[PDB]
Design a binder for this molecule. Structure first.
Ligand SMILES: Cn1cc(Nc2ncc(C3=CCC[C@@H](NC(=O)c4ccccc4)C3)nc2C(N)=O)cn1
Ligand SMILES: Cn1cc(Nc2ncc(C3=CCC[C@@H](NC(=O)c4ccccc4)C3)nc2C(N)=O)cn1
Lengths: 295, 284
């Protein structure tokens, strides 16, 4: 729909249009490289995903169309895709400072104002994704990128941006779909039903930026999961008291509401004093980036 | 609410991430039982054990593997249950070949009785398929369990294995109690697919990549599957498949309404049909 706001995939080596520079990272999502446009000199990031020989082109085109229509200032901008020698290459906006986890592992804990600006920017991205009937499902410091201008970008839009190995692992969790009714298959493909899980993850991420680890990081993962099934379950909180304002403690209290029925939406969270206060701008993050270079 | 409604290990029957199931014999009478050996969670307490045992004791029906009792021994929870000697319908049809229309009609009636019971208790099974329908030596049909709500421990371990660490996950994504996006009618669809599976040895689209199937089923004009060999089946069986596989859940019939369908309400549907199927195993 052109009323809401050119080829889908090039059958060509992206090295025909870009000079591959340094490897930025890697993992289950594939490998990401910094690159430079041969004509304009503009910098981009290129993600290389290994494809299976039997991956069908019909499904790949449907997946790429989702990347093409899901766009917001607070999500890494998608530019295009290349399919060459069994590798899918996704071209996108370059975020020079890497993830918030890459940064805080050097700088230490963020200030309350720096966290407030990050939360506001992530909530703007989530309000957009939730309006499009998508669920991110992987909000955390390692998945929030920062560019050299101090701007915040979600690394991708989560569930519906998965391709390659990450998507293969999610398909294993879903299991065989041949007996699912269409409405069950819809929830499985979307990655869930309740988008308010993202609001909880943002609350945990605010603690992660304040404390350098999410709550209970040291507890065996299967125990953390089992404790969430118990009737006595209590959500986590900030470890320190006086270091943080009453507005920050309240933001954590309301985002970390165990019952999704009582948890606020992304748009309602954007009205919370913590993220609606004046003085939240990229200058706060330029100060964090300067700390990174001159410690 | 009461107003509503030792052992010798013989051989391993089943196993998975949940634990193991063994065939067992009572030393006193020689009665055969199935014993499921479960590792309890490190944070399992008196109240969590009590709620799971209460659900096992109270969620009861003839067409669901019967709970007999449980005990703690060798640091494991042992659940004693009804023994179903012939295994699952999948274990059987992989040897015998496809079931006859009458055999499928009896299996569908028996599963629908189990589902009408679960749905009356506000439970959604969400795991109906040939591999999860067990048959005893008398030809009787039993759902292996009451569904995904009897598999919480295994789902948590599967989530850790394929999704990752849980530190940023909301508690509702793990507690998985009142799931949204669908209701009990998803079980009626799965039973329709199971009827095709018993007729054809595979569900429809069994050879299509899972991601492609998810995109196909979620497309607006999705056409529900049908039995592929038209002349082999009656018009009642074709209609049973058509109504169970209603794409819109708002229009899909309930388990109790399905029990009134000519296919499963016809006379002559009894466990002898399944004893005939088990006779094919002795001399294949
Ligand atoms: C250490 N370092 C890392 C970086 N910079 C990046 N590091 C990692 C990544 C990503 C990793 C995994 C997801 C990927 N996103 C997508 O594939 C995608 C985006 C939009 C729509 C659909 C899909 C982004 N991107 C950068 C960067 N864009 O600059 C600088 N320094
Ligand atoms: C090959 N073979 C297999 C069998 N027989 C069984 N095989 C597998 C299983 C099961 C496997 C996993 C689920 C388990 N059910 C439960 O844990 C449960 C039951 C009721 C309520 C709540 C939970 C039953 N049971 C048998 C059997 N009872 O005789 C013979 N031959």
């Amino acid at each position: 729909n052109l009323y809401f706001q050119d080829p889908d995939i090039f059958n060509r080596d992206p090295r025909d249009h870009y000079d591959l520079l340094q490897r930025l990272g890697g993992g289950t999502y594939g490998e990401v490289f910094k690159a430079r446009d041969k004509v304009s000199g503009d910098l981009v990031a290129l993600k290389m995903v290994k494809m299976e020989p039997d991956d069908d082109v019909s499904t790949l085109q449907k997946e790429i169309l989702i990347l093409k229509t899901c766009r917001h200032a607070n999500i890494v901008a998608y530019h295009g895709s290349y399919l060459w020698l069994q590798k899918l290459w996704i071209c996108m906006e370059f975020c020079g400072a890497g993830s918030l986890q890459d940064i805080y592992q050097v700088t230490g804990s963020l200030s309350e104002l720096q966290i407030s600006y990050v939360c506001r920017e992530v909530l703007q991205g989530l309000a957009y994704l939730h309006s499009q009937k998508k669920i991110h499902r992987d909000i955390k410091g390692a998945n929030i990128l920062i560019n050299d201008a101090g701007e915040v970008r979600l690394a991708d839009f989560g569930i519906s941006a998965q391709i390659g190995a990450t998507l293969a692992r999610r398909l294993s969790f879903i299991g065989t779909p041949y007996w699912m009714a269409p409405e069950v298959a819809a929830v499985a493909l979307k990655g869930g039903y309740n988008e308010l899980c993202d609001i909880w993850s943002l609350g945990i991420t605010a603690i992660e930026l304040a404390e350098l680890q999410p709550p209970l990081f040291d507890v065996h993962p299967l125990r953390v999961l089992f404790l969430m099934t118990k009737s006595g379950y209590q959500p986590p909180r900030l470890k320190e008291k006086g270091k943080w304002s009453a507005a920050f403690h309240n933001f954590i209290k309301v985002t970390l509401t165990a019952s999704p029925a009582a948890r606020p939406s992304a748009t309602k969270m954007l009205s919370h004093q913590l993220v609606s206060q004046p003085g939240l701008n990229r200058g706060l993050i330029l100060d964090l980036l300067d700390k990174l270079k001159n410690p």
